[PDB]
Amino acid sequence: VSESFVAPLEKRAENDVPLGNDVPIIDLQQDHLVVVQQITKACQDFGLFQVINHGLPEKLMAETMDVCKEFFALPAEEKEKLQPKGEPAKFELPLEQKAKLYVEGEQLEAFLYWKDTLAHGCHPLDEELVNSWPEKPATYREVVAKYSVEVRKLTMRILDYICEGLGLKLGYFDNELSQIQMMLTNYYPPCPDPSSTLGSGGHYDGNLITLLQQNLPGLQQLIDAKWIAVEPIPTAFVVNLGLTLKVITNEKFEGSIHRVVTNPTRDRVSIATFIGPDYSCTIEPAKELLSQDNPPLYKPYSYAEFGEIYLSDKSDYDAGVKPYKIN
Ligand SMILES: CN1[C@H]2C[C@H](OC(=O)[C@H](CO)c3ccccc3)C[C@@H]1[C@@H](O)C2
Ligand SMILES: O=C(O)CCC(=O)C(=O)O
Ligand SMILES: [Fe+2]
Ligand SMILES: [Sr+2]
Ligand SMILES: [Sr+2]
């Protein structure tokens, strides 16, 4: 592979990462209190769980994966239309809601992730936003509009389960804290040397909560510097708690630290729905949960200020929130 994609020695993935047998798989059609309790335990102990029987149509999940795969099969002349000034955009502020193709890496030793990402905003859905989405394939806009609404519906159900678990009023996150919905469609082409590369460097999702749809292996979670493989369940969503939710819960909940490894033989598409605050938001531990026994571990901070650090500084997983740590 090009030296551009060679990860630093310490960040390279070992070849035999074990299946995470203890990754919670939570059936959302269990009794209400059982669902709240199982989600609460997963949030406290892991920060990553899968949801099944989640009420989002399986047919729509399949149709969305199909149209996302069809997009990444488009020829160069079509993909160029989403490359500003002839090259992929960077994950940096301002992060615009119009559709673009993105490149990503780390400036520490600088290297690139073995990944192409299509990203666009999804909320609120209006003609201007959808008109800024891919023109091809022809059905992308119709399918992904329906998917966007359904994934948001499921995310808001999960956030209300989280509210009940924490003792926050229902709808606590149904406001500026969930206003941005970025859909990141990740394409991992086959890689000649998986031992040297990463599809996605180890990270927290910096936002509130992410729902991830996958049908192939490659996703790994950090649990004593131990990585585990997250079983692909094509009809499930992987729920990743973001660094923003870790802060708001005053670390009562864990954030998901995860990475993606490359494959030498097959390509892989994943669909990540990033829900989180507007860039104008102030983030702090929920005052409702604080006491002398539970003092705040973070001072209030600008989500925009956090965002700039989160997207630039990859010296540590929580580099984005280190400046705001107290007590
Ligand atoms: C591997 N990279 C991580 C960092 C960055 O994430 C973002 O760009 C999100 C997109 O919502 C973001 C979160 C919080 C603040 C700003 C941006 C781009 C991608 C994502 O898949 C996660
Ligand atoms: O491709 C995956 O399974 C992970 C995607 C992801 O972590 C992300 O987009 O943030
Ligand atoms: Fe992620
Ligand atoms: Sr180009
Ligand atoms: Sr347009």
Side-chain angles (χ1 to χ4, degrees), residues 91 93 95 104 113 115 182 184 186 200 203 205-207 274 279 303 306-307 310-311:
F91 291 109
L93 304 186
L95 189 60
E104 193 181 5
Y113 299 163
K115 173 171 72 75
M182 295 301 293
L184 274 65
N186 302 305
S200 202
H203 66 278
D205 293 351
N207 53 305
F274 274 71
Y279 300 102
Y303 190 63
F306 158 80
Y310 170 68
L311 291 177

mmCIF file with all atom_site columns, all heavy atoms in Angstrom, residues 91 93 95 104 113 115 182 184 186 200 203 205-207 274 279 303 306-307 310-311, ligand 1:
data_model
loop_
_atom_site.group_PDB
_atom_site.id
_atom_site.type_symbol
_atom_site.label_atom_id
_atom_site.label_alt_id
_atom_site.label_comp_id
_atom_site.label_asym_id
_atom_site.label_entity_id
_atom_site.label_seq_id
_atom_site.pdbx_PDB_ins_code
_atom_site.Cartn_x
_atom_site.Cartn_y
_atom_site.Cartn_z
_atom_site.occupancy
_atom_site.B_iso_or_equiv
_atom_site.pdbx_formal_charge
_atom_site.auth_seq_id
_atom_site.auth_comp_id
_atom_site.auth_asym_id
_atom_site.auth_atom_id
_atom_site.pdbx_PDB_model_num
ATOM   1   N N   . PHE A 1 91  ? -13.142 16.420 7.375  1.00 0.00 ? 91  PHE A N   1
ATOM   2   C CA  . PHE A 1 91  ? -13.926 16.548 8.624  1.00 0.00 ? 91  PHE A CA  1
ATOM   3   C C   . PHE A 1 91  ? -13.290 17.669 9.443  1.00 0.00 ? 91  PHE A C   1
ATOM   4   O O   . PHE A 1 91  ? -12.310 17.435 10.173 1.00 0.00 ? 91  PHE A O   1
ATOM   5   C CB  . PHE A 1 91  ? -14.004 15.207 9.352  1.00 0.00 ? 91  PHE A CB  1
ATOM   6   C CG  . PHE A 1 91  ? -14.845 14.183 8.634  1.00 0.00 ? 91  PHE A CG  1
ATOM   7   C CD1 . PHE A 1 91  ? -14.258 13.090 8.016  1.00 0.00 ? 91  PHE A CD1 1
ATOM   8   C CD2 . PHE A 1 91  ? -16.222 14.323 8.561  1.00 0.00 ? 91  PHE A CD2 1
ATOM   9   C CE1 . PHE A 1 91  ? -15.037 12.145 7.366  1.00 0.00 ? 91  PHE A CE1 1
ATOM   10  C CE2 . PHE A 1 91  ? -16.997 13.381 7.906  1.00 0.00 ? 91  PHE A CE2 1
ATOM   11  C CZ  . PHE A 1 91  ? -16.402 12.291 7.312  1.00 0.00 ? 91  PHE A CZ  1
ATOM   12  N N   . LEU A 1 93  ? -14.652 21.989 10.909 1.00 0.00 ? 93  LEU A N   1
ATOM   13  C CA  . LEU A 1 93  ? -15.752 22.981 11.005 1.00 0.00 ? 93  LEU A CA  1
ATOM   14  C C   . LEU A 1 93  ? -15.440 24.138 10.057 1.00 0.00 ? 93  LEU A C   1
ATOM   15  O O   . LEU A 1 93  ? -14.280 24.518 9.920  1.00 0.00 ? 93  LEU A O   1
ATOM   16  C CB  . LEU A 1 93  ? -15.891 23.446 12.457 1.00 0.00 ? 93  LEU A CB  1
ATOM   17  C CG  . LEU A 1 93  ? -16.104 22.333 13.486 1.00 0.00 ? 93  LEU A CG  1
ATOM   18  C CD1 . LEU A 1 93  ? -16.364 22.923 14.865 1.00 0.00 ? 93  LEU A CD1 1
ATOM   19  C CD2 . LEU A 1 93  ? -17.243 21.410 13.080 1.00 0.00 ? 93  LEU A CD2 1
ATOM   20  N N   . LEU A 1 95  ? -18.749 21.979 9.358  1.00 0.00 ? 95  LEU A N   1
ATOM   21  C CA  . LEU A 1 95  ? -19.188 20.704 8.737  1.00 0.00 ? 95  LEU A CA  1
ATOM   22  C C   . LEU A 1 95  ? -20.568 20.937 8.116  1.00 0.00 ? 95  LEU A C   1
ATOM   23  O O   . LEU A 1 95  ? -21.572 20.942 8.856  1.00 0.00 ? 95  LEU A O   1
ATOM   24  C CB  . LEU A 1 95  ? -19.201 19.582 9.780  1.00 0.00 ? 95  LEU A CB  1
ATOM   25  C CG  . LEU A 1 95  ? -19.424 18.175 9.222  1.00 0.00 ? 95  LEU A CG  1
ATOM   26  C CD1 . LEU A 1 95  ? -18.335 17.801 8.225  1.00 0.00 ? 95  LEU A CD1 1
ATOM   27  C CD2 . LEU A 1 95  ? -19.489 17.150 10.342 1.00 0.00 ? 95  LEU A CD2 1
ATOM   28  N N   . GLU A 1 104 ? -10.175 11.148 5.367  1.00 0.00 ? 104 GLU A N   1
ATOM   29  C CA  . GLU A 1 104 ? -9.903  11.300 6.815  1.00 0.00 ? 104 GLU A CA  1
ATOM   30  C C   . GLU A 1 104 ? -8.600  10.596 7.173  1.00 0.00 ? 104 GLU A C   1
ATOM   31  O O   . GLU A 1 104 ? -8.280  9.574  6.551  1.00 0.00 ? 104 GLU A O   1
ATOM   32  C CB  . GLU A 1 104 ? -11.053 10.732 7.646  1.00 0.00 ? 104 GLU A CB  1
ATOM   33  C CG  . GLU A 1 104 ? -10.992 11.133 9.108  1.00 0.00 ? 104 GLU A CG  1
ATOM   34  C CD  . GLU A 1 104 ? -12.110 10.568 9.962  1.00 0.00 ? 104 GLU A CD  1
ATOM   35  O OE1 . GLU A 1 104 ? -12.913 9.765  9.440  1.00 0.00 ? 104 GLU A OE1 1
ATOM   36  O OE2 . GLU A 1 104 ? -12.162 10.922 11.157 1.00 0.00 ? 104 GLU A OE2 1
ATOM   37  N N   . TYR A 1 113 ? -6.841  7.171  6.723  1.00 0.00 ? 113 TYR A N   1
ATOM   38  C CA  . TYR A 1 113 ? -7.740  6.009  6.910  1.00 0.00 ? 113 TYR A CA  1
ATOM   39  C C   . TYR A 1 113 ? -8.091  5.437  5.536  1.00 0.00 ? 113 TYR A C   1
ATOM   40  O O   . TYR A 1 113 ? -8.301  6.221  4.585  1.00 0.00 ? 113 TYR A O   1
ATOM   41  C CB  . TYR A 1 113 ? -9.007  6.426  7.658  1.00 0.00 ? 113 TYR A CB  1
ATOM   42  C CG  . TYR A 1 113 ? -8.815  6.973  9.052  1.00 0.00 ? 113 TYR A CG  1
ATOM   43  C CD1 . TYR A 1 113 ? -9.835  7.683  9.664  1.00 0.00 ? 113 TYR A CD1 1
ATOM   44  C CD2 . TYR A 1 113 ? -7.657  6.754  9.785  1.00 0.00 ? 113 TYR A CD2 1
ATOM   45  C CE1 . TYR A 1 113 ? -9.706  8.176  10.952 1.00 0.00 ? 113 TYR A CE1 1
ATOM   46  C CE2 . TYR A 1 113 ? -7.507  7.253  11.069 1.00 0.00 ? 113 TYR A CE2 1
ATOM   47  C CZ  . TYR A 1 113 ? -8.536  7.968  11.657 1.00 0.00 ? 113 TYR A CZ  1
ATOM   48  O OH  . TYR A 1 113 ? -8.427  8.454  12.929 1.00 0.00 ? 113 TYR A OH  1
ATOM   49  N N   . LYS A 1 115 ? -10.557 4.510  3.662  1.00 0.00 ? 115 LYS A N   1
ATOM   50  C CA  . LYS A 1 115 ? -12.008 4.802  3.781  1.00 0.00 ? 115 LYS A CA  1
ATOM   51  C C   . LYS A 1 115 ? -12.386 5.970  2.868  1.00 0.00 ? 115 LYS A C   1
ATOM   52  O O   . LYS A 1 115 ? -11.651 6.972  2.846  1.00 0.00 ? 115 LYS A O   1
ATOM   53  C CB  . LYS A 1 115 ? -12.334 5.126  5.241  1.00 0.00 ? 115 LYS A CB  1
ATOM   54  C CG  . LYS A 1 115 ? -13.751 5.611  5.519  1.00 0.00 ? 115 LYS A CG  1
ATOM   55  C CD  . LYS A 1 115 ? -14.063 5.699  6.994  1.00 0.00 ? 115 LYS A CD  1
ATOM   56  C CE  . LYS A 1 115 ? -13.369 6.850  7.694  1.00 0.00 ? 115 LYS A CE  1
ATOM   57  N NZ  . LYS A 1 115 ? -13.984 8.160  7.374  1.00 0.00 ? 115 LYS A NZ  1
ATOM   58  N N   . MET A 1 182 ? -26.224 13.705 10.966 1.00 0.00 ? 182 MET A N   1
ATOM   59  C CA  . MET A 1 182 ? -25.292 13.462 9.840  1.00 0.00 ? 182 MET A CA  1
ATOM   60  C C   . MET A 1 182 ? -25.349 11.970 9.519  1.00 0.00 ? 182 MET A C   1
ATOM   61  O O   . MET A 1 182 ? -25.171 11.158 10.447 1.00 0.00 ? 182 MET A O   1
ATOM   62  C CB  . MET A 1 182 ? -23.859 13.877 10.192 1.00 0.00 ? 182 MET A CB  1
ATOM   63  C CG  . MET A 1 182 ? -23.693 15.370 10.439 1.00 0.00 ? 182 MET A CG  1
ATOM   64  S SD  . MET A 1 182 ? -24.157 16.416 9.026  1.00 0.00 ? 182 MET A SD  1
ATOM   65  C CE  . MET A 1 182 ? -22.879 15.978 7.849  1.00 0.00 ? 182 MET A CE  1
ATOM   66  N N   . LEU A 1 184 ? -23.358 9.248  7.671  1.00 0.00 ? 184 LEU A N   1
ATOM   67  C CA  . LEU A 1 184 ? -22.024 8.914  7.124  1.00 0.00 ? 184 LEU A CA  1
ATOM   68  C C   . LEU A 1 184 ? -22.117 7.511  6.536  1.00 0.00 ? 184 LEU A C   1
ATOM   69  O O   . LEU A 1 184 ? -22.300 6.547  7.311  1.00 0.00 ? 184 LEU A O   1
ATOM   70  C CB  . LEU A 1 184 ? -20.975 9.014  8.235  1.00 0.00 ? 184 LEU A CB  1
ATOM   71  C CG  . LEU A 1 184 ? -20.387 10.406 8.455  1.00 0.00 ? 184 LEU A CG  1
ATOM   72  C CD1 . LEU A 1 184 ? -21.452 11.372 8.941  1.00 0.00 ? 184 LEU A CD1 1
ATOM   73  C CD2 . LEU A 1 184 ? -19.218 10.357 9.426  1.00 0.00 ? 184 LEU A CD2 1
ATOM   74  N N   . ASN A 1 186 ? -19.955 4.849  4.884  1.00 0.00 ? 186 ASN A N   1
ATOM   75  C CA  . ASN A 1 186 ? -18.510 4.518  4.860  1.00 0.00 ? 186 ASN A CA  1
ATOM   76  C C   . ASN A 1 186 ? -18.275 3.402  3.852  1.00 0.00 ? 186 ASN A C   1
ATOM   77  O O   . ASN A 1 186 ? -18.986 2.391  3.921  1.00 0.00 ? 186 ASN A O   1
ATOM   78  C CB  . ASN A 1 186 ? -18.017 4.079  6.233  1.00 0.00 ? 186 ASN A CB  1
ATOM   79  C CG  . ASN A 1 186 ? -18.266 5.142  7.279  1.00 0.00 ? 186 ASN A CG  1
ATOM   80  O OD1 . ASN A 1 186 ? -17.842 6.284  7.121  1.00 0.00 ? 186 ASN A OD1 1
ATOM   81  N ND2 . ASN A 1 186 ? -18.944 4.776  8.353  1.00 0.00 ? 186 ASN A ND2 1
ATOM   82  N N   . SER A 1 200 ? -10.750 2.816  9.918  1.00 0.00 ? 200 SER A N   1
ATOM   83  C CA  . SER A 1 200 ? -11.134 3.927  10.817 1.00 0.00 ? 200 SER A CA  1
ATOM   84  C C   . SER A 1 200 ? -10.277 3.817  12.076 1.00 0.00 ? 200 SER A C   1
ATOM   85  O O   . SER A 1 200 ? -10.319 2.766  12.721 1.00 0.00 ? 200 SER A O   1
ATOM   86  C CB  . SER A 1 200 ? -12.613 3.870  11.130 1.00 0.00 ? 200 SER A CB  1
ATOM   87  O OG  . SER A 1 200 ? -13.101 5.141  11.537 1.00 0.00 ? 200 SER A OG  1
ATOM   88  N N   . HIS A 1 203 ? -11.618 5.678  17.955 1.00 0.00 ? 203 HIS A N   1
ATOM   89  C CA  . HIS A 1 203 ? -12.287 6.956  18.304 1.00 0.00 ? 203 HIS A CA  1
ATOM   90  C C   . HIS A 1 203 ? -13.532 6.699  19.149 1.00 0.00 ? 203 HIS A C   1
ATOM   91  O O   . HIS A 1 203 ? -14.153 5.634  19.004 1.00 0.00 ? 203 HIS A O   1
ATOM   92  C CB  . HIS A 1 203 ? -12.645 7.740  17.031 1.00 0.00 ? 203 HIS A CB  1
ATOM   93  C CG  . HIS A 1 203 ? -13.674 7.090  16.161 1.00 0.00 ? 203 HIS A CG  1
ATOM   94  N ND1 . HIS A 1 203 ? -13.354 6.097  15.253 1.00 0.00 ? 203 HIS A ND1 1
ATOM   95  C CD2 . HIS A 1 203 ? -15.010 7.279  16.053 1.00 0.00 ? 203 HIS A CD2 1
ATOM   96  C CE1 . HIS A 1 203 ? -14.450 5.699  14.631 1.00 0.00 ? 203 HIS A CE1 1
ATOM   97  N NE2 . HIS A 1 203 ? -15.482 6.416  15.094 1.00 0.00 ? 203 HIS A NE2 1
ATOM   98  N N   . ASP A 1 205 ? -17.241 8.395  18.940 1.00 0.00 ? 205 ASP A N   1
ATOM   99  C CA  . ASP A 1 205 ? -18.103 9.343  18.197 1.00 0.00 ? 205 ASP A CA  1
ATOM   100 C C   . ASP A 1 205 ? -18.267 10.570 19.106 1.00 0.00 ? 205 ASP A C   1
ATOM   101 O O   . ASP A 1 205 ? -18.638 10.393 20.276 1.00 0.00 ? 205 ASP A O   1
ATOM   102 C CB  . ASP A 1 205 ? -19.419 8.683  17.787 1.00 0.00 ? 205 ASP A CB  1
ATOM   103 C CG  . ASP A 1 205 ? -19.283 7.578  16.751 1.00 0.00 ? 205 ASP A CG  1
ATOM   104 O OD1 . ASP A 1 205 ? -18.172 7.407  16.192 1.00 0.00 ? 205 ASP A OD1 1
ATOM   105 O OD2 . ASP A 1 205 ? -20.297 6.910  16.487 1.00 0.00 ? 205 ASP A OD2 1
ATOM   106 N N   . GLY A 1 206 ? -17.956 11.770 18.614 1.00 0.00 ? 206 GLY A N   1
ATOM   107 C CA  . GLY A 1 206 ? -17.904 12.992 19.446 1.00 0.00 ? 206 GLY A CA  1
ATOM   108 C C   . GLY A 1 206 ? -19.286 13.504 19.807 1.00 0.00 ? 206 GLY A C   1
ATOM   109 O O   . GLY A 1 206 ? -19.396 14.273 20.782 1.00 0.00 ? 206 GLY A O   1
ATOM   110 N N   . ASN A 1 207 ? -20.301 13.069 19.059 1.00 0.00 ? 207 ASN A N   1
ATOM   111 C CA  . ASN A 1 207 ? -21.714 13.526 19.148 1.00 0.00 ? 207 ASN A CA  1
ATOM   112 C C   . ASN A 1 207 ? -22.426 12.853 20.330 1.00 0.00 ? 207 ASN A C   1
ATOM   113 O O   . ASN A 1 207 ? -21.744 12.359 21.255 1.00 0.00 ? 207 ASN A O   1
ATOM   114 C CB  . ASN A 1 207 ? -22.429 13.259 17.822 1.00 0.00 ? 207 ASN A CB  1
ATOM   115 C CG  . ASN A 1 207 ? -22.269 11.818 17.393 1.00 0.00 ? 207 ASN A CG  1
ATOM   116 O OD1 . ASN A 1 207 ? -21.137 11.342 17.281 1.00 0.00 ? 207 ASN A OD1 1
ATOM   117 N ND2 . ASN A 1 207 ? -23.371 11.126 17.162 1.00 0.00 ? 207 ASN A ND2 1
ATOM   118 N N   . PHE A 1 274 ? -25.252 9.777  12.791 1.00 0.00 ? 274 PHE A N   1
ATOM   119 C CA  . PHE A 1 274 ? -24.650 10.609 13.858 1.00 0.00 ? 274 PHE A CA  1
ATOM   120 C C   . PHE A 1 274 ? -25.694 11.624 14.313 1.00 0.00 ? 274 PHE A C   1
ATOM   121 O O   . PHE A 1 274 ? -25.977 12.558 13.544 1.00 0.00 ? 274 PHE A O   1
ATOM   122 C CB  . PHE A 1 274 ? -23.408 11.327 13.326 1.00 0.00 ? 274 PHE A CB  1
ATOM   123 C CG  . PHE A 1 274 ? -22.139 10.525 13.416 1.00 0.00 ? 274 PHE A CG  1
ATOM   124 C CD1 . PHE A 1 274 ? -21.926 9.427  12.602 1.00 0.00 ? 274 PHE A CD1 1
ATOM   125 C CD2 . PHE A 1 274 ? -21.149 10.886 14.313 1.00 0.00 ? 274 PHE A CD2 1
ATOM   126 C CE1 . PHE A 1 274 ? -20.749 8.698  12.698 1.00 0.00 ? 274 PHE A CE1 1
ATOM   127 C CE2 . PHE A 1 274 ? -19.980 10.152 14.414 1.00 0.00 ? 274 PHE A CE2 1
ATOM   128 C CZ  . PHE A 1 274 ? -19.786 9.054  13.611 1.00 0.00 ? 274 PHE A CZ  1
ATOM   129 N N   . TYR A 1 279 ? -23.933 23.100 16.626 1.00 0.00 ? 279 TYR A N   1
ATOM   130 C CA  . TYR A 1 279 ? -22.569 23.611 16.918 1.00 0.00 ? 279 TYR A CA  1
ATOM   131 C C   . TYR A 1 279 ? -22.653 24.803 17.881 1.00 0.00 ? 279 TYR A C   1
ATOM   132 O O   . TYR A 1 279 ? -21.639 25.104 18.525 1.00 0.00 ? 279 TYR A O   1
ATOM   133 C CB  . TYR A 1 279 ? -21.849 23.893 15.598 1.00 0.00 ? 279 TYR A CB  1
ATOM   134 C CG  . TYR A 1 279 ? -21.732 22.646 14.761 1.00 0.00 ? 279 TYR A CG  1
ATOM   135 C CD1 . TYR A 1 279 ? -22.570 22.420 13.680 1.00 0.00 ? 279 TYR A CD1 1
ATOM   136 C CD2 . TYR A 1 279 ? -20.846 21.643 15.116 1.00 0.00 ? 279 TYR A CD2 1
ATOM   137 C CE1 . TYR A 1 279 ? -22.490 21.251 12.940 1.00 0.00 ? 279 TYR A CE1 1
ATOM   138 C CE2 . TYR A 1 279 ? -20.754 20.469 14.388 1.00 0.00 ? 279 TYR A CE2 1
ATOM   139 C CZ  . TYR A 1 279 ? -21.580 20.272 13.297 1.00 0.00 ? 279 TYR A CZ  1
ATOM   140 O OH  . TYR A 1 279 ? -21.500 19.113 12.575 1.00 0.00 ? 279 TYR A OH  1
ATOM   141 N N   . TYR A 1 303 ? -19.773 23.435 22.152 1.00 0.00 ? 303 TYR A N   1
ATOM   142 C CA  . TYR A 1 303 ? -19.732 22.235 21.278 1.00 0.00 ? 303 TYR A CA  1
ATOM   143 C C   . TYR A 1 303 ? -18.851 22.525 20.053 1.00 0.00 ? 303 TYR A C   1
ATOM   144 O O   . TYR A 1 303 ? -18.143 21.606 19.601 1.00 0.00 ? 303 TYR A O   1
ATOM   145 C CB  . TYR A 1 303 ? -21.145 21.802 20.889 1.00 0.00 ? 303 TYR A CB  1
ATOM   146 C CG  . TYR A 1 303 ? -21.220 20.460 20.207 1.00 0.00 ? 303 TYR A CG  1
ATOM   147 C CD1 . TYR A 1 303 ? -20.840 19.303 20.866 1.00 0.00 ? 303 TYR A CD1 1
ATOM   148 C CD2 . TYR A 1 303 ? -21.687 20.342 18.909 1.00 0.00 ? 303 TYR A CD2 1
ATOM   149 C CE1 . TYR A 1 303 ? -20.908 18.067 20.246 1.00 0.00 ? 303 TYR A CE1 1
ATOM   150 C CE2 . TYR A 1 303 ? -21.768 19.113 18.276 1.00 0.00 ? 303 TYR A CE2 1
ATOM   151 C CZ  . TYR A 1 303 ? -21.383 17.972 18.951 1.00 0.00 ? 303 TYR A CZ  1
ATOM   152 O OH  . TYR A 1 303 ? -21.476 16.759 18.333 1.00 0.00 ? 303 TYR A OH  1
ATOM   153 N N   . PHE A 1 306 ? -15.169 22.325 21.270 1.00 0.00 ? 306 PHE A N   1
ATOM   154 C CA  . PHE A 1 306 ? -14.964 20.861 21.415 1.00 0.00 ? 306 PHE A CA  1
ATOM   155 C C   . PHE A 1 306 ? -14.761 20.236 20.027 1.00 0.00 ? 306 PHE A C   1
ATOM   156 O O   . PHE A 1 306 ? -13.799 19.465 19.845 1.00 0.00 ? 306 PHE A O   1
ATOM   157 C CB  . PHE A 1 306 ? -16.148 20.212 22.137 1.00 0.00 ? 306 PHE A CB  1
ATOM   158 C CG  . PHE A 1 306 ? -16.268 18.738 21.858 1.00 0.00 ? 306 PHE A CG  1
ATOM   159 C CD1 . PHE A 1 306 ? -15.467 17.829 22.525 1.00 0.00 ? 306 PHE A CD1 1
ATOM   160 C CD2 . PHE A 1 306 ? -17.143 18.271 20.891 1.00 0.00 ? 306 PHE A CD2 1
ATOM   161 C CE1 . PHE A 1 306 ? -15.544 16.475 22.239 1.00 0.00 ? 306 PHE A CE1 1
ATOM   162 C CE2 . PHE A 1 306 ? -17.221 16.916 20.605 1.00 0.00 ? 306 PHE A CE2 1
ATOM   163 C CZ  . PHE A 1 306 ? -16.428 16.022 21.285 1.00 0.00 ? 306 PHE A CZ  1
ATOM   164 N N   . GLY A 1 307 ? -15.646 20.562 19.079 1.00 0.00 ? 307 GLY A N   1
ATOM   165 C CA  . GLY A 1 307 ? -15.650 19.989 17.719 1.00 0.00 ? 307 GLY A CA  1
ATOM   166 C C   . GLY A 1 307 ? -14.318 20.187 17.020 1.00 0.00 ? 307 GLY A C   1
ATOM   167 O O   . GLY A 1 307 ? -13.802 19.223 16.423 1.00 0.00 ? 307 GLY A O   1
ATOM   168 N N   . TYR A 1 310 ? -11.757 17.908 18.767 1.00 0.00 ? 310 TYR A N   1
ATOM   169 C CA  . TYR A 1 310 ? -12.159 16.507 18.481 1.00 0.00 ? 310 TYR A CA  1
ATOM   170 C C   . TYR A 1 310 ? -11.696 16.110 17.072 1.00 0.00 ? 310 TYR A C   1
ATOM   171 O O   . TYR A 1 310 ? -11.146 15.002 16.899 1.00 0.00 ? 310 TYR A O   1
ATOM   172 C CB  . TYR A 1 310 ? -13.670 16.348 18.659 1.00 0.00 ? 310 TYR A CB  1
ATOM   173 C CG  . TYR A 1 310 ? -14.205 15.032 18.160 1.00 0.00 ? 310 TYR A CG  1
ATOM   174 C CD1 . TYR A 1 310 ? -13.887 13.851 18.804 1.00 0.00 ? 310 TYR A CD1 1
ATOM   175 C CD2 . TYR A 1 310 ? -15.009 14.968 17.036 1.00 0.00 ? 310 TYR A CD2 1
ATOM   176 C CE1 . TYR A 1 310 ? -14.366 12.633 18.347 1.00 0.00 ? 310 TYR A CE1 1
ATOM   177 C CE2 . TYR A 1 310 ? -15.498 13.760 16.566 1.00 0.00 ? 310 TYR A CE2 1
ATOM   178 C CZ  . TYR A 1 310 ? -15.170 12.590 17.223 1.00 0.00 ? 310 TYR A CZ  1
ATOM   179 O OH  . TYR A 1 310 ? -15.646 11.397 16.757 1.00 0.00 ? 310 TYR A OH  1
ATOM   180 N N   . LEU A 1 311 ? -11.892 16.991 16.090 1.00 0.00 ? 311 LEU A N   1
ATOM   181 C CA  . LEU A 1 311 ? -11.645 16.670 14.659 1.00 0.00 ? 311 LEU A CA  1
ATOM   182 C C   . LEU A 1 311 ? -10.154 16.804 14.314 1.00 0.00 ? 311 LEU A C   1
ATOM   183 O O   . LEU A 1 311 ? -9.745  16.207 13.302 1.00 0.00 ? 311 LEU A O   1
ATOM   184 C CB  . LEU A 1 311 ? -12.521 17.576 13.784 1.00 0.00 ? 311 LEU A CB  1
ATOM   185 C CG  . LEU A 1 311 ? -14.027 17.307 13.849 1.00 0.00 ? 311 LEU A CG  1
ATOM   186 C CD1 . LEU A 1 311 ? -14.792 18.317 13.008 1.00 0.00 ? 311 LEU A CD1 1
ATOM   187 C CD2 . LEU A 1 311 ? -14.357 15.890 13.401 1.00 0.00 ? 311 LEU A CD2 1
HETATM 188 C C1  . LIG B 2 .   ? -14.036 8.379  11.958 1.00 0.00 ? 1   LIG B C1  1
HETATM 189 N N1  . LIG B 2 .   ? -14.371 9.800  12.109 1.00 0.00 ? 1   LIG B N1  1
HETATM 190 C C2  . LIG B 2 .   ? -14.820 10.162 13.461 1.00 0.00 ? 1   LIG B C2  1
HETATM 191 C C3  . LIG B 2 .   ? -14.643 11.672 13.602 1.00 0.00 ? 1   LIG B C3  1
HETATM 192 C C4  . LIG B 2 .   ? -15.423 12.450 12.574 1.00 0.00 ? 1   LIG B C4  1
HETATM 193 O O1  . LIG B 2 .   ? -16.794 12.586 13.067 1.00 0.00 ? 1   LIG B O1  1
HETATM 194 C C5  . LIG B 2 .   ? -17.538 13.607 12.599 1.00 0.00 ? 1   LIG B C5  1
HETATM 195 O O2  . LIG B 2 .   ? -17.201 14.337 11.713 1.00 0.00 ? 1   LIG B O2  1
HETATM 196 C C6  . LIG B 2 .   ? -18.853 13.717 13.343 1.00 0.00 ? 1   LIG B C6  1
HETATM 197 C C7  . LIG B 2 .   ? -19.996 13.967 12.370 1.00 0.00 ? 1   LIG B C7  1
HETATM 198 O O3  . LIG B 2 .   ? -21.194 14.217 13.087 1.00 0.00 ? 1   LIG B O3  1
HETATM 199 C C8  . LIG B 2 .   ? -18.726 14.786 14.413 1.00 0.00 ? 1   LIG B C8  1
HETATM 200 C C9  . LIG B 2 .   ? -19.095 14.527 15.729 1.00 0.00 ? 1   LIG B C9  1
HETATM 201 C C10 . LIG B 2 .   ? -18.987 15.513 16.700 1.00 0.00 ? 1   LIG B C10 1
HETATM 202 C C11 . LIG B 2 .   ? -18.518 16.763 16.372 1.00 0.00 ? 1   LIG B C11 1
HETATM 203 C C12 . LIG B 2 .   ? -18.152 17.035 15.073 1.00 0.00 ? 1   LIG B C12 1
HETATM 204 C C13 . LIG B 2 .   ? -18.251 16.055 14.098 1.00 0.00 ? 1   LIG B C13 1
HETATM 205 C C14 . LIG B 2 .   ? -15.437 11.796 11.213 1.00 0.00 ? 1   LIG B C14 1
HETATM 206 C C15 . LIG B 2 .   ? -15.503 10.284 11.294 1.00 0.00 ? 1   LIG B C15 1
HETATM 207 C C16 . LIG B 2 .   ? -16.725 9.758  12.037 1.00 0.00 ? 1   LIG B C16 1
HETATM 208 O O4  . LIG B 2 .   ? -17.097 8.499  11.502 1.00 0.00 ? 1   LIG B O4  1
HETATM 209 C C17 . LIG B 2 .   ? -16.254 9.648  13.495 1.00 0.00 ? 1   LIG B C17 1
#
